[model samples]
Target: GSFVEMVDNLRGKSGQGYYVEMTVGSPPQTLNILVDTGSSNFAVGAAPHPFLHRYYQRQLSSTYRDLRKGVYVPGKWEGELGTDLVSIPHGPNVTVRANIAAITESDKFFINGSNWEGILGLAYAEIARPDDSLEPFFDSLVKQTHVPNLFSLQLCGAGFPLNQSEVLASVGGSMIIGGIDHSLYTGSLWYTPIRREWYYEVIIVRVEINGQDLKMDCKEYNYDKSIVDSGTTNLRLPKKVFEAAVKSIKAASSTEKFPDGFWLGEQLVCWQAGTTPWNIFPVISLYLMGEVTNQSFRITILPQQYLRPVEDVATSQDDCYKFAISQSSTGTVMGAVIMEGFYVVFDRARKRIGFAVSACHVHDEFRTAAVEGPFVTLDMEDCGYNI
Candidate 1:
């Protein structure tokens, strides 16, 4: 189980990320909605969608009816936008009226392969119906005057296999709304000032593959912008960075003989269950600018977090893997690859984000990834900052 997955009951996954179990309607229509951070729309499939077993029928809720105001994703999704009183049945609870979008129309990609019926965007309101003033769900909590202006998350499903009745030692994750859980992390957290509010934007100065300094331009890592996203299942790098990363990975691993199709995600490669060259794969590190002047810290991810496990041809003893880093036209994303290793705090009240070694894994056990350094850079600080 080298792959990343969501925890149970709320076991529902959007491929995008984990969904929270929330009661959406007035009479309590329960649904596992996705907890996404990239966008600011709280969307639910209201009628006629391909994948969901159940939809959030607006008619069933006394607080909502055939609403006219609609939100959209250009040609992909169109939904009737409104608000509904909700019960935060998991994590923390304070019944606040939250913004909701009942998706009436969608392209296949919207809900094509998911069971999660709703999406609760945790970012600010600028991306969603901003011009018309639709507030994001988590933002609704702050305005309600019942919760703090912060939230933290630790989703620990990276290597834990699914559908198991084996040991039953741990739960899937922690979605602590309105506060940080100090117990789920180790050491003092490194704080990074968010550059923008639209998408929890951050500044990434260097991309070190293994210990080899690629020496790429610092600002190129930001391209249009960079973000710490929760919805994306894989790490996304700008095309330039993606090429350098893949090329670097190929040279450093046993992937040289594989055809282009494999890396292109059109082919699958298998190996004997315990024979994968995992450790031989490079440790990818990201240096994020700290809130302090001229200071930065790093988070490094091992191959376990990047070598996506494929079950399509999974035999009893053979394992398959897919290349996890994808090419984004813009923005380098620290998604689950960066997330599965750290306890991430979206401290909006302080205009910063924090990262610490995630405590979801056992304290004494070895981890697949890590967070370290105030690495001060010139011979040391310059290399850490520029390279």
Candidate 2:
């Protein structure tokens, strides 16, 4: 059997995040954990020690076992090793007694004042933090439960308003465990080989801005390999690529301009009040190498996908906009912001990632439709939050 859970979009002080629910006990204790692919080891407790509200207590679970040792990851986290049974109650009774990191204390980095109980690591076991690098919960679950060796994620876009009252976002997306659902997307799926198992790194041939190719030297710009990480919020690009994109966006604008009028504050790029980003910003396209035929494939990011409205303004009247920032100088990170426009697949068994135009934003009906079991061949339409 397979599992499908609604992934909630959370807006917080730092930024955006997404999470799903899973039971972790004999009698079944449910918890909402942040879904992350950048690191491994499912840990509990998002707050500091002695005040661990909404945390997984070892005593509460009948199948809990303390390993009596601590697992530490320098600036990120430090926790005690423990094992317990985990399951998706909505799906089959497929349960696995997997090793989990039980946090006793945490730095300010992990305690972001969100409602999430912990992080459910979705990366390969090789990247796990523990010395033993215990197999991730999902990896063991799929193997032991006889489910498919893949999971599909659909992260909701950021246009919806924040409502903390609901456990999951009313207009949010979903995650499917086991196999691909054929009902959620449109067009044929395109794939690119994974260069590394530890991370979903793929070969990127080139990047285009506004139909103009950004002539890139792979060695100079580090564009040869890029990681598709759902844990990240914004697109991280190299220095030259970032500069070229910003210059192109500015050149394509049709709104009012002044000597120092290009920028509003620091993070926002000001435009005329009535003008939307899609009318001004250039479309960004990434050419990725496909593993199926060793050919190149294109993933276009519409202007509406790259630009976001600047929050909380005085008199901007929805004029303030911000392009996805470039934070990585050496690495290319395709985060949730750009990924939401396309239907993405992380196929570990196939060692490749698939993409298609998603139907999520075009129709509200796509948000409510999802399929389980084997991949159902059906005609469908095409359809992320940040971390």
Candidate 3:
């Protein structure tokens, strides 16, 4: 039921993450790792800590080998670099030699009560911790096994209310390694050429709230950088763009304004246990520059995914929802808030990122994604290029 290094479909961590259960070592120690597109190191928890349940122990594996260099992620994490045989537990039934970062220490990055051991960064080796000379795990897999140079991701936690289940329940989705699956999505995928390999960087030509444009210079939308990252939890906007979005959404709301702290992700807006004002919030869209000249396409997320709900931070009896978004100091991060609405393809072979409406994106019989056009774009310059 499998092709020669062609496809291996696996379930993911949830709407916010596409973590997968992978085995590394001779004895094959198992760990559920976040498949993050934001970084380049394949890091795993190796030391004992209260926050972690279990970690990879090198002593148990005969194939483990140590390396001289260390992984330095600067302010985030750092650890000894090593090597091991890596593969999935119930996947392609194959193994490949890959670099492994045995994370010995960390900061506020790793959290407890969440079901993940560490992160497996799927980007290029350019951003590999320490330096680009080190080979990345995904690169090793594709090169050694001859797997196709593309992978696909889809997350499905949008629009599900908290009262429906234990908030900690697994958010369901799948990640297809090396190939595309037709059943997971209904329509065809439209692609935008990648701007950089460091991250899944792409140029955003425009931003919109509902059908109204935010009306900023196209270059500003790509100002800094625009990336599609599976590791980031929210759809982060640039500081200037975030304020404009808040202003636009607020202008369209029929009710009085909520507290200022709420928009900053500090406080929550509570309703005395009633259905959220679904019609009040508007759809948010990002228009990405396409592979074809003068063509641009946009993927839209409904209000339910953008203005998300919350139940853990407060003890209030009323139903509460967090803003679920924040202002980014670096890049415009297209995180789970927007990605959960579509099936995303990282076609490294063509250096492009593609999007299609996810079949699992439907919430209560309503599809949560909208896509429009290979429309003619007005600003013809490369939005991400430096003058």
Candidate 4:
């Protein structure tokens, strides 16, 4: 496969750039962003000027005009207010004004990777909440227009086996639009009500692995808040929970070769015999905050072969797998790999995030749509899957 170049928000699309830089400051700063749900962070780079490129880009596009002069910037620009990011309370939208000074001094300015110049942190106004906090944005929009619901990219491309021939292999399978494909799973949909000021906290009442009941009520077993962040590429498992998950999978496998990474084995991947001690992979379950909508939801453990080992590890790609059971800050971070067979939605309006089974269909609709939107001053698309 040819090397794939990472693009800006268009390629890794969220919903809209409006979700970002929604509020400019009192003095006013022009904001331009291509919204992306691929990740949760929204920030400007280390550029000498944050809004300059945006201003110029809009100027170049005969369609956009400088509305910055009319925009409002808050008087309080420093101290806790500077970090006082978070959504407006009670579904009221907070107008985001650009602080020229702040934009210029952004920490990740022009950071390496992708054509995007800066980031417009949309995860949550509060730096801490990445999963849920778009209620105000959505509510405001809802007041004016019929909310078109929400969407997510299912089965991230990073989760798939390396397609040595595709340029867009690093990207996920594609955006799983609307709902999910009903064909994948026979289980019911279990929903957790949105709770909390920032992240949508859902009670994880119960958890199981490979049909074995694991305790989730214990402190060592759960998190008050476990969020789904698109910005992150992997699933984060809490230390204790991660251990249980990995152990169950290991227990099921008869030929657990590569121990540390994603590598399963050259031809032996998914090849362990059922009778072998290391053959069967474990399938875990979680009873979400909501009622028992789906009592059968399971998290299957992949053999070591599915993992792609890190560059520092020995053994060539042909001889190695590349993943491992890892823990997250609170729970297990569900990176690209864990996103398989599921559809995710980061609904900013309701201050919630949702997930369910999903599959690839259009394959190219999202990338094309991103390039054609109004806020989209620029766009780029790539698809490198083995259809």
User: Can you write out model 1's per-residue Cα lDDT over 1-387, one digit (the tens) per residue?
Assistant: 111222232343213366667888778888777777787888887886557778887778887644467666763677777788887676554677887878888876455454467777888877776343787888888888677898887766545233223212335466778777777778778888887698888888677888787678776677767888888877888888788888888888865477798777567677777676665678888888877677788887777677665554544556676777888876788787677778899999999999988875322234356788887642222322121
lDDT, ranked from best to worst? 3, 1, 2, 4
Q: Which candidate is the best by lDDT?
A: 3
Compute the lDDT for candidate 2: 0.61
- Residues 1-387, model 3: lDDT tens digits: 133232323334333365778988878888888878889899999998777898989889899999967776763777889899999764556699889899888886677655678888999989987889889987988889867888887776645344334533544566777777776676778999888788999999988888899998777776688899888878898888888988998887747687889778777777776666667777788888877888899898876677666664556666677787789888688887777788898999999998998876744334357777878886646567464
Q: How do the residues 1-387 of candidate 4 rate in per-residue lDDT, one tens digit apiece?
A: 010111111233121111222323333333533333433333332233433344222223232223232111221111111221222221123332222222333333332323344333334334322223423232333344443344343443332233333322234343322233344223343344444434433434455554576753334444434554444444456776777766665665545543444422222232222222222444445444432332212333333212432322332343323344456655434444444434455554454555554433111212110000011111111100011
Can you give the lDDT of residue 28 in candidate 2? Answer: 74
Clashes of 3: 0
> How many backbone clashes can be found in candidate 1?
6
The residue ranges of model 3 lying beyond 4 angstroms of the native Cα positions read 1-16, 161-171, 272-274, 312-318, 362-367, 385-387
Ranking by TM-score: 3, 1, 2, 4
Give the runs in model 1 whose Cα sits over 4 Å from its true position. Answer: 1-16, 65-67, 110-113, 130-132, 160-171, 254-256, 314-316, 361-368, 377-387
State the TM-score for model 4: 0.54
Better of 2 and 4 by TM-score: 2
For all candidates in order, the CA lDDT equals 0.71, 0.61, 0.77, 0.35
Global Cα lDDT for candidate 4: 0.35
Q: Least accurate stretch of 10 residues (summed lDDT) in model 1?
A: 1-10
Give me the runs in candidate 2 sitting further than 4 Å from their true place: 1-14, 46-52, 90-93, 111-113, 160-168, 219-225, 254-266, 269-277, 313-321, 362-387
Task: Report clash pairs, candidate 1.
Answer: 376-381, 377-380, 377-381, 377-382, 378-381, 378-382
